[PDB]
Each structure stands twice: as C-alpha cells, then as structure tokens.
Amino acid sequence: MFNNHEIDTILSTLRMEADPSLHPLFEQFEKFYEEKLWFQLSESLTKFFDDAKSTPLRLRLYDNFVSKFYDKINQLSVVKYLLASLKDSKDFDESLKYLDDLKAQFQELDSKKQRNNGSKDHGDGILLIDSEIARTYLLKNDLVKARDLLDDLEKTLDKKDSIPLRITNSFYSTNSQYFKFKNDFNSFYYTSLLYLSTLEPSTSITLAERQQLAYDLSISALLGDKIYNFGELLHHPIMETIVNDSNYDWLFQLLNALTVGDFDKFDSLIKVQISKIPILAQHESFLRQKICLMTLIETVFVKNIRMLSFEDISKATHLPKDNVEHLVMRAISLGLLKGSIDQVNELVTISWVQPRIISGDQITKMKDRLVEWNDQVEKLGKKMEAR
Template identity: 35%
Template sequence: MSAKVASYLSRQQASTDEATAAVYSKLEDLYNKKLWHQLTLATLEAVRLSYFTEQPGRLKDLYDNFISDFEHRINPLSLMEIAMFCLLDFGDKDLSIKFVEKIKLKIKGQKEASVLAETALGNIYIRSRELPEVKKIIEATQSCLDELDGITTVHSRFYELSSDYYKLEGNHACYYRETLRYLGCIDLSELPKERQYERAYSLSLAALLGEGIYNFGELLAHPILEAIKNTDKQWIVDLMYAFNSGDISKFESSQDLLSKQPDLAKANQKLKMKICLLCLMEMTFNRPSNNRRITFEEIAKETRLETNEVELLAMKALSLGLVRGTIDQVDQCVTMTWVQPRVLDLSQIGTMQKRLAQWCEDVKQMEMLVENKAHDILT
C-alpha cells in the first residue's frame, strides 16, 4: 500500500463516524488482500452512500487518493460506473470533461464502458445547455449502443440522456419514444416519487402534442401514470383516455383545463385534428370488417366537423397510414378495409371480444348451412 493511500484511509477512519469508518476499514482490508473484484464491488457500494453525496469534495478525494491507485485493476464498465458518481463532485464543466476524457483512455475497446463515457459527456453538455454537442454524442453513440446484447444499465443511462435532450429541444414525439425506452430499462420503484410524477406528466403532454403519435394504449397501460392519478394532474390522464377512444365530447368539455396549459392551449387546433383522426379510427375499429362503409354525414356527426371537412379528414387519415380504404366523393362515403393496430384499453378489448363472439356465431351458422345443404350438393 502506498503512503498516500495509507495516509488517506487512516485519516478518514479517524475523522468519521463509526459506520463510515467501518466502510473505510473494509476498503482497506480488501485492498491489502488484493481482492480486486471484491474491492470494486465494495467501492461501487461506497460511492452511493449519503456520506459522500451530502458534502461536495468527498467523492473527488476518494477518487484522487484511493481509487486512482488501483483503477487499472477495475473492470472498465465498473470503473466508468464509479466515475459517473465521482462526476457529481465536479462543478466545473471543463474539469468534468477532462476527467471523463482521462477515463476514456483507460477503458478504450470496451463497448459498454465507452457508451457510458459518452453518455457522461452528454450529461455534462446538457447541464450547460450545449444542445448541438449533445446531439453529436447521441448520434455517434446510438450505433454503438445498438450493437450491445440485451438490455443493460448503459441503455437506461443513454435513453435518459436522449429523452432529456429531446425535451429541451421541444421534440415531443422523440421525447415520448425515448422516455418509454428509458422506463423500459429501469425498475420504476428505484425512481424517486417526484421524478415519477414529473416524468408521467411530461410523457402525457408529449403523447398529446407529439407528431405522429396516435397510439396511447402503451402509455395508458404503463404503471408510471400511477404517479399522477388522483392528483391535480389527473385531468391529463382522463384526456388521454378521451383521445384513445376518440371521444370528442370529452375533449370539448376539457377546454378550460387545456387553456391553462400553455403548450396545449397553443396547439388546440392540432389537438382537435388529432382527436378527429382517432375518432375516425375508432369508428372503423368498432364496425365489423364486412360493414365498413361510413357516410360523410355519420363521420361529421361523430367528429362534429362540417360535412365539407370530412373528405379532407379521411384523406389525411389515409395519407398517415392510420386507415386504408377508398373515398367515394359522389356517394359521399368512405369504405375502410383496414385500421392501424393499436394497444387496446379494456373497453376496446371488450369490443373485440364481442366481434370475435359474432364471428364464431357466423362460422357456426355457415357450418350448419353446409351440413343441411350437403345432400343437395353431393347429389
């Protein structure tokens, strides 16, 4: 053991409380025994302790006086994980970047660790709102991330970074996609309640405002929404259910709430078009496949549009790939042959159940018809 390490550990054991001193004693014991794997695991546990986070400088001292002495013996990914915690002590941007660049030289060739290092750099730039730099890192690192097998903690860190970037950029659709990816990589119970609340609300806004998002079922089924249910933000969950089922009445009755949220108030007309498209999808979905001829008048009544606006609505739905079919301008009707698959809520599943039951009944009747007419056919 070097004199520097011995002096640091001795000083810390003498100046801290009994519990923290025991941590330092354990680190010293593993270091002396050269049990590098066990020492790495113990160090990963230590850097998470509140003792190191409650006062600035302690993590940096731990790294400079202890970890740096045996960092060449630490698994590259674990070294980068430890470095991520130590970065919390670097308030200066330039010092933080210099620290990460130094670590990158020591983990070269290890993909997961390299992705985590780039993510750490992205977090530094995002704190200083240097979005062009963050964008470069995300674009350059995505391909490397895609080469990794399975889902790791590296994925969650990267998707958290990318979702934060798209939120700052104001790209609702990308924020929605990346946040769902991030939530799919973590144990939700490990996310603090206030963070769950913030994520759930931001994600709900992104779902409503995002271009091309016409499937709310995945979010509505996600446990993250429990964080805002029965709170002052319950209204946005109810609004998403209204959009998911194309409920125009619910949308119109929520105008007072929408007007109080600046982003939603600004996008009111786009939201009206989106829910009308979803209403058309729901009308198509609710009809049996052999009866999907819908008149302009029926669509106008459900969407509360003028009859002369229905054709444009149908054309937009067709162009977006939400439905397939034909428009008969002469007879003022549309004939739908397909509707985009969606994650269904319980009421929609109930509709599907009824249609399957009807289909089974039709098959049974056809079977009986063939059985009754079999004699005539065979003779």
C-alpha cells in the same frame, strides 16, 4: 458517524490484513468527513448502498487510489459512482478530467481485460465517455452541435453491446431534452415509450424518476400521435403513485374527455400555460377527430359493412365536411385506413389495415366464427372421401 469506518473495516479485514487502498492517514478521514450515517463515498459492497448526498467534491481522494486499489474491489469499480454522483454537480472542468483525460488504453488493455460499461460492478469507463458527452453538453450547445454528439453515440451503440438496457436511458434522456427544444413532439413520444420499458432493471428504480417521467408522458401523449389516443395511459399507471395535480391532473380529465368529446371538458384540460404553444391548436382537433373516428370504425364494422358516409363523421367532430375530407388524410398517412373517400356519392370507402388492439369483447363471437363457420367446410368435405 462511524458507520463508514465500522462497516468498511469488517469487509476489508476479512480480505486484507491492512487496508491496501486506504492510506493510513486516509483511514481515519473516512469517518471524519460528515455527521450523517452514510457519507459521499464508500468501497466494495458497502458502496452499493451509498450514493451522492449534496456536492461530492471529495471523489478526487477516491480517484487517488490506483496501485493497491484492486486488492479490495476490482480496479474497474472506480468509475461506477464517480460520474453518477457528479450528475447533479454540473461542472465543465470536472467532467473533462473524467472524460477527455480518461482517454483509452490506460492500464486496462495490458495486464487485464475490458468489459466496457463501468457504472456497475467493475468495468472500464471508455464506453462511459461517449455516453456522458451528450449529457454534459446537453444544456450547453444547441440543436446544431447536438447532432454531432449523437453520431459518435448511435454508431457506438451498434458497434459494441451491453447487457443492461440502461445505456438507452441516457440515450433517451438526451433525446428527451433534444426533442423538447424542438416543436413537433412526435419523436419525443416514441422516445419515452422505450424509456419506460428500461425502468424495470437497476440504476434508479426509485419513484423520483416517475415524477419527472409522468410530466414527459403527459405532454408527449397530448401532442404526439402513435397508437390510439389515451389507450397507453391505462397500460402503466405510474402517475397514480405520484403527485396528482400540477399538470398531472390533465390526464385525469383527458381519459374521459376523448370518449365523450365535449367542448366543456376541454376547458378543464388545456389552460393558459399550455395555450401559448401554437402546436396545441393543431393537435386539439387531431385528438378529438381521431378518437371519434376510432369509435366509428368499431361501429361501422359488424358483418358486411365496410363503408361509412359523411353523416356520423362530420356530426361527431363538429367540423365542415370540406375540411374533414382532408383532415382524415393527415391521419391516413399514419397507416390507419387505406381507403379512398368519394365526393358525389357522399360515401367513405374504408380499407382497414389498423391493428386495433385491446380485444376480448370480440373474441367471444370472433373466435367462434372461425370454428362454427369453418365447420361448414368440414361437413361439406366429408362427401369427397370416395378417393
């Protein structure tokens, strides 16, 4: 409707008498495009509330403003939504014109400065080039050429700095599909962890991102192993605010399945769709054996007992003692326990380096044993005050 012309007129008139960037033929075209309230392009502060609609092919007219453009909003605001609205366009020719043809040293290093960035406020798109090359070629090339695109990127990340952490989101979004094309998801799980911490700032705080992120966190935590098993599911319950079923309900049963460890609960967990991956069969016994071990480690540690045996370990995992010795060693190399399991003695020696977070049940007795037992040293040291 007329919301494009009316709102832009107020902000422009209070600054410029006549629109410097808008050509007098293009001024009427602002409200002439669509029938909706918000169109596919805008300027200055009005552009902040504007985003892409369907296929913003009219951005060429917005790029046509160069000379007098900076008299309204700074000249570096062109590339803000230029490549943001084309994210759903998926075109190779339109990407090369805004990346390779953009090059560097255009007008910005002559009469102005350069803040790099470019997707917020006003910044130059040189830093935007190296960030968007990996996304455009993500669905084009394969795992071979995908490594060379990360070399010019990761090295650029350490070469220059940016205040917003959103630049890692595009870095983690590329590695998300890069690790998805592979087999082992261990690297895919650690990638989504730092991606969630960067969701708090701007650049799409909407809940549409949590829908696709919950699907990544469900598969990453299933076949990945870093900290506990399900312990990271209750830290950020962003999945409870989105669709419950369609692969999102597997984490509902997985929460109470690992605490129990019954085979009947696993039938509702894995289905025919997820059972076509051979990696699932390997980590099916890795999740249950670890969560049953985490309980035994908390159980074995009371006061003086650092040592387990082959009884409670094999009965909980329902596995023969011959394999269990070598199956824990796969989790031993992860930094859990440094102990050395014996054979003839049938006793598990445990050197426990594991942090084991989520405290507060122990701290009642744990913290008091660092005072009352330490007070025994203070009482016995009062007889040393002679000199």
